[PDB]
Amino acid sequence: RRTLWTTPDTSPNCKMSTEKDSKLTLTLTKCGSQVLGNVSLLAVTGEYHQMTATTKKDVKISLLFDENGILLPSSSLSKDYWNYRSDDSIVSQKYNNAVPFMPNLTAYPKPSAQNAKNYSRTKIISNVYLGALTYQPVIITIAFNQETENGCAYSITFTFTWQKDYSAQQFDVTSFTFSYLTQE
Amino acid sequence: RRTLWTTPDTSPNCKMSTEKDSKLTLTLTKCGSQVLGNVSLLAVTGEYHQMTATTKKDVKISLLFDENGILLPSSSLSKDYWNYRSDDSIVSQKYNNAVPFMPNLTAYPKPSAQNAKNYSRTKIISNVYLGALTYQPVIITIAFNQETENGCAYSITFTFTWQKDYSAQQFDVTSFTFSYLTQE
Amino acid sequence: RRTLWTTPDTSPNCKMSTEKDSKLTLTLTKCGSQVLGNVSLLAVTGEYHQMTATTKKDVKISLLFDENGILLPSSSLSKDYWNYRSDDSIVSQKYNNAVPFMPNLTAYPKPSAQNAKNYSRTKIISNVYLGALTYQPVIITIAFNQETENGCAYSITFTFTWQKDYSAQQFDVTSFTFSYLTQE
């Protein structure tokens, strides 16, 4: 099967600040040697649901995977509705190999003191927009295989960083399309 | 068939200001659970072909679809050369089901007073560039299923919004790649 | 076969300033009527490896192709490891037709004094980020079929243009995803 996703509902599945305070909408569609990805993030409860002037303007969502491409429980995203697509839900409560969706380790090597600088190609940096308002940019940084947390074999992280005061708003961002080279 | 498009010629097919004043170049390629889209817009005649200081710096192009995924005549885009790909033209003068190209209604629900705020994930916001000049950004906003005009079941709209004075130029923008989750 | 690439290693394959001073990481994945592309560029030696205040802040990488979609030797990119994917390397030392990966000549016509202005849709313009640092934007311009150098039938060029002083840094940029309409 060719799509791994969170499902497209709004049921919380993620930790921005506290457990299951947010919905990460993530779809990874296998296109041969690349995955076509689509992501967005919504705070449902907790600090990011009604930001203050002191809420930290830098949020990292970590997906850590094992040797089989299966999500580790220490990830920010819950394993419960992260699986292969079946209709607008997921195939079952199971541990299905997903190595063909994992980021290529040659393109995106793990950090190593071998070389101090990792290659910039391990990241994608762009802007998305808070509240879908054109004057409210948020930087999205997607990083591949840059985590070493908990013995992970692969990782995809999504960081959202900004400078403007978005106090008294709900964190919610426009959708972002991306791709990356896959392992096989 | 896996691509719906306008064809890649420059024959006017769209209304920015007046009927058939512009060429919308749009290609939607089905990649499983996502469409890979590519869009751009050129004013051939009318106000946007030679903008003035008062030309409105906000243009919305609406594609409205019925229950079968077929374009409604009240759309900004003409039905005549919007169809499935056949060579660098289209398969025929016909009404072909296209539900698998439509934006997913769970990911991108229609507006409803049920909840005041629609989800920001229903939009993509980025920049394209007028005249392909790097100092001339134009905001592109792509919105999925946010129209209710004329009983539509689905919609894709492309809005172009800017602040700089582009008077005495022809509206024409760089190409923009995007994706979205599909209905089945 | 459905992917043409440089391979994902870091072995220099490109000229920014001098021959084989850089690694262009480029993957072109055929998705029907579009290619899904992914690019980045790293200076390994030469001026761009340790920029000065006078290093030119505009770098054009040219891929020129013949009638068969095969890379011309006068391109910036070396032919040696540019080929169809086989594992994380390439299929062989050969000249394999690649017309289905070439940019569509109707969408992206060659320049002609027929019409002074080429269509802006022949370019993609966006930002990538030097060193994967969010405060270091670099403009990427991707252009399709705009070269006439050396009798080429098709071309893809990647230009990187910036204004900030990045002296004493190594040129290296985040990855950029794009698509374009193909020839058949």
Residue numbers in the entry:
A (entry chain A), B (entry chain A), C (entry chain A): 186 to 369
Sentences from the paper on this structure:
Here, we have sought to generate high-resolution crystallographic structures of the cellular interacting fiber-knob domains of species D adenoviruses HAdV-D26 and HAdV-D48. The fiber-knob is the receptor interacting domain of the fiber protein, one of three major capsid proteins along with the hexon and penton base, as shown schematically in Fig. 1a. We next calculated the amino acid variability at each position in the aligned adenoviral fiber-knob sequences, which revealed regions of broad conservation corresponding to β-strands which make up the main fold of the fiber-knob trimer. Each monomer interacts with two neighbouring copies to form a homotrimer with 3-fold symmetry and a highly stable interface. Analysis of the adenovirus loops reveals an intricate network of polar interactions which stabilise their three-dimensional structures.
To investigate whether the different loop conformations were the product of flexibility, or restricted mobility we investigated the inter-loop interactions in the HAdV-D26K and HAdV-D48K structures. The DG-loop of HAdV-D26K is calculated to have interaction energy of −6.5 kcal mol−1 in two separate stretches of this exceptionally long loop. Loops which can occupy a CAR inhibitory conformation but have fewer stabilising contacts, such as that of HAdV-D26K, should be more permissive to CAR binding. HAdV-D26K shows a very low affinity interaction with CD46, however the kinetics are extremely fast making it impossible to measure an accurate KOn/Off at any of the concentrations measured, suggesting an unstable interface. The calculated KD for HAdV-D26K is seen to be more than 1.5 × 103 times lower than that of HAdV-B35K. We demonstrate that HAdV-D26 and HAdV-D48 fiber-knob domains have a weak ability to bind CAR, and negligible CD46 interaction, suggesting that these viruses are unlikely to utilise these proteins as a primary receptor in vivo.
